């Protein structure tokens, strides 16, 4: 028996909109402490891990650890049928045959109840070692999205150069090169993700822009994005969901042979 | 372009 | 001869945009109290009946009953050249095979004069008897449109079920099934009109959604829609036009 | 060298979006009294002349007349990387093959630095002698654009007729014909610019609608457009840029033989 | 299913 | 259609 109730159901809509263009099917290992997801991209180039904690729901209830294999495309298609003010509840019986999504409207008039066919799926889970990274930059989500979108039209690879002074994003292609530099803003307050660069060692690596633009689909999810990185290790892009939890994207650097 | 799973 | 002057010409723009994607050619039976139209699908499965009465016009004038054969695609293409604040006037001479559309601008600066070649078409029209329907639901236009659109993503067939309390819409497809339930909402405001379900006999039947999504293209015409149905009979979807008249879509059930 | 600083940089973005669908390659004849360019379309049927004067810039600086050959598509691709509130600065060293673009954000935290590969191109400048036209109509830009699109959906050729009473736009095609009539009622303002028809002799010519819809891509530059013409000469479509200067489109009529 | 739809109207 | 080079001239 599993039943979870989230009042501000917009978070779930945005999560699936963030994950629909990378993964087609993914296993939701529904435990008792919350909901987790861990998978790699359809191209074995990036890693997505979503975490929502049971404490963050308005009515969470689980009796046995379950593993729902869901086609994220179908889930997102179903979730588009809900308004941004509904109360969304997930439900799964003991036998994990079908998953139920229930949308309650703020007015009791509209109530939608869909049920999608599940699949069995073995989880090749990759344990990600938690180390301390050289650079950790905390910046606006929308600003990062603008950076990635703008640089996509120049070349196909971005060079992030975290430094003590500021952070620089560069790219180069057939039509020339471009590079943009950001600096820590004057400490106004906690004003809408002020750019804070916590540097431990200077860093510079290269990444592919396609998967970064895939990652930035989780922008409406948070107002702050955290880019954490070190040399020759996967870059971490963390979008924190309010209280509930977070969503992390791991991307491998671009080398040359 | 490196890869994922070699970390460690 | 025929000459009509309509101020809120957005009505004509929206009518033709609503019906352009279902029928290609249609005969317009110009009467004495107004304009009527009745036609079938390219698959002979649904019937549309539009009615606009002279009282809703600013200057109505008709002399002899005419049946103007119009290419609905061309009609909508011409009407897209007029703004929703333009004043649209239709004109047709006594012995002529061309329809004249004139758009007056709000500031009188712009005057548009188009003329489209008509075509012959006889009156293949099925007389609809005025019946009393078992259940009649009155709901918001946007709500109906959203329901149809959402249910289209599941399967291709809808099961409408009515009961004393409310009406339920169901669908099923490859990726599972879905169901939506509406109820007699709070009596305060009739604009976001709570399902006003008049129950006479219990009802549950099946329909195809494609033609329903064709139907819902008439949503911008009114703010409330009336879906009327009874067992083993075609459903009526009535969009009420302000003063002028109405536009009804009849759809045959799936047995 | 060459160095220009423009605060309200949306203007340049709108110009480049206006010229991207007509000219692909053009030389920017950067002089000392300002910057102008004059070129023809990919089919040698229409002529574009853009003029911006040095007085209209916020910091202009030029040392030697240069003619930098730019791929308008690439330039627009780079200019799309700037917001409509940015401050754009152009820079080019004496005899160089790269153009430097710098975008300043409304706040000083973010500064973007792009560099575009220039190319050589010798433009055999033609030249329009300034004559006086029979009829000159000044109308709203949006109204002209709406007329152009509406009449383009009928046929592909338009017949413009200036006369004492008013100005008439006609078209005819497979699905019938259409006619638009303008009047010069009391001229309230140049903002809601009522059509001002200054006629010297009655005139009527025919033009292709495709190139007019290309021209109407320059609508966001001004709120009024001036159509100037006389018999058996190219029609002039003038979009006046605020203060800066202007942009003229010359289009050849469709004649007989 | 799949009526028809002249079944209940004719002319 | 006209030219318009039949209207102006560089070289």
Curated annotation (Swiss-Prot), chain C:
The modification N6-acetyllysine is found at residues 14, 77, 80, 248. Changing residue 128 to A: Complete loss of interaction with UHRF2. Residues 7-100 are annotated as: Interaction with NUDT15. The keyword Thylakoid does not apply. Its main location: nucleus. Phosphorylated. Phosphorylation at Tyr-211 by EGFR stabilizes chromatin-associated PCNA. Transmembrane segments: none annotated. One of its GO terms (biological process) is cellular response to hydrogen peroxide. One of its GO terms (cellular component) is PCNA complex. There is a cross-link at residues 164, 254 (Glycyl lysine isopeptide (Lys-Gly) (interchain with G-Cter in SUMO2)). InterPro entries: DNA_clamp_sf, Pr_cel_nuc_antig, Pr_cel_nuc_antig_C, Pr_cel_nuc_antig_CS, Pr_cel_nuc_antig_N. The modification Phosphotyrosine is found at residue 211. It is linked to Ataxia-telangiectasia-like disorder 2: A neurodegenerative disorder due to defects in DNA excision repair. ATLD2 is characterized by developmental delay, ataxia, sensorineural hearing loss, short stature, cutaneous and ocular telangiectasia, and photosensitivity. Antibodies against PCNA are present in sera from patients with systemic lupus erythematosus. Auxiliary protein of DNA polymerase delta and epsilon, is involved in the control of eukaryotic DNA replication by increasing the polymerase's processibility during elongation of the leading strand. Induces a robust stimulatory effect on the 3'-5' exonuclease and 3'-phosphodiesterase, but not apurinic-apyrimidinic (AP) endonuclease, APEX2 activities. Has to be loaded onto DNA in order to be able to stimulate APEX2. This is Proliferating cell nuclear antigen. It comes from Homo sapiens (Human).
């Amino acid at each position: 028996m599993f039943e979870a109730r989230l009042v501000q159901g917009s978070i779930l809509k945005k999560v699936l909109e963030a994950l629909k263009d990378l993964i087609n099917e993914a296993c939701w290992d529904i435990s008792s402490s919350g909901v987790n997801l861990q998978s790699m991209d359809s191209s074995h180039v990036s890693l997505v891990q979503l975490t929502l904690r049971s404490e963050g729901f308005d009515t969470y209830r689980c009796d046995r650890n379950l593993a729902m294999g869901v086609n994220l495309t179908s889930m997102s298609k179903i979730l588009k049928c809900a308004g941004n003010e509904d109360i969304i509840t997930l439900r799964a019986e003991d036998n994990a045959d079908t998953l139920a999504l229930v949308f309650e409207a703020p007015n009791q008039e509209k109530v939608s109840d869909y049920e999608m066919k599940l699949m069995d799926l073995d989880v090749e889970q990759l344990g990600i070692p938690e180390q301390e990274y050289s650079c950790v930059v905390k910046m606006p989500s929308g600003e990062f999205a603008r950076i990635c979108r703008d640089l996509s039209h120049i070349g196909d690879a971005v060079v992030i150069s975290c430094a003590k002074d500021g952070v620089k994003f560069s790219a180069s292609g057939e039509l020339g090169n471009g590079n943009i530099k950001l600096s820590q803003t004057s400490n106004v307050d906690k004003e809408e993700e002020a750019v804070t660069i916590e540097m431990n060692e200077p860093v510079q690596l290269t990444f592919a822009l396609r998967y970064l633009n895939f990652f930035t689909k989780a922008t409406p999810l948070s107002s702050t994005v955290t880019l954490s990185m070190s040399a020759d290790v996967p870059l971490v892009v963390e979008y924190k969901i309010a209280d509930m939890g977070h969503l992390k994207y791991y991307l491998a650097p671009k080398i040359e042979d | 372009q490196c890869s994922m799973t070699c970390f460690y």
